[PDB]
Amino acid sequence: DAGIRTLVMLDEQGEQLERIEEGMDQINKDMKEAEKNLTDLGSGGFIRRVTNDARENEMDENLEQVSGIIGNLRHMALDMGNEIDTQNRQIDRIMEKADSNKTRIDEANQRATKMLG
C-alpha cells in the first residue's frame, strides 16, 4: 500500500511539474514580448521438516507467498524509480529559465530608470 501511494503521489508531482514548466515558458515569452514592445514604444520445500507435521508445511507456504510479493515489489519499485530522473532534469531546466527571467526583468527596470536621468 505504501508503494502504491508513493507511485501515485510521484505521478501527481510530475504532472504538476510539467504544468509549472509550461507556465514558466509562457511567462518568459510574454515578458520578452512586453519588453520588446515597450522598447519599441520609444520450490520443492523451504525447510527440511524433521518431524513432518503441519507446522513445517504452513511456514513453507507463507515463505512462498512472501517471495512472490517481494518479486512483484522489485519491478514496481524500479518503475517508480524511473520517474524521478525525468522530473529532476525538468526541474533543473526550469531553474535556469526562471533565473534568466528574473535577471532580465531586473536589468529591464534599471534600463527604464537610466534613460529618464
Binding site: 520450490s43 526541474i91 528574473k102
Partner: protein, 63 residues
C-alpha cells in the same frame, strides 16, 4: 533448492536496498531544489510586482 531460493531472495533484497537508497538520495536532492525554487519564484514575483508598481507611479506622475 534451499540455497538457490534463499540466495535469490537475498539478492532481490540487496537490489531493492541499493536502488531505494539511490532513489532516496536523489529525492532529497530534488526536494532541496524545489525548496530553493520556492524562494526563487517568490523573490522574482515580488520584485517584478515592485518594478511594475514603480513604473505605474512614475508614468502617472508624469501624466
Amino acid at each position: 533448492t534451499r540455497h538457490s531460493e534463499i540466495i535469490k531472495l537475498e539478492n532481490s533484497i540487496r537490489e531493492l536496498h541499493d536502488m531505494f537508497m539511490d532513489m532516496a538520495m536523489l529525492v532529497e536532492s530534488q526536494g532541496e531544489m524545489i525548496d530553493r525554487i520556492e524562494y526563487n519564484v517568490e523573490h522574482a514575483v515580488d520584485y517584478v510586482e515592485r518594478a511594475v508598481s514603480d513604473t505605474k507611479k512614475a508614468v502617472k506622475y508624469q501624466s
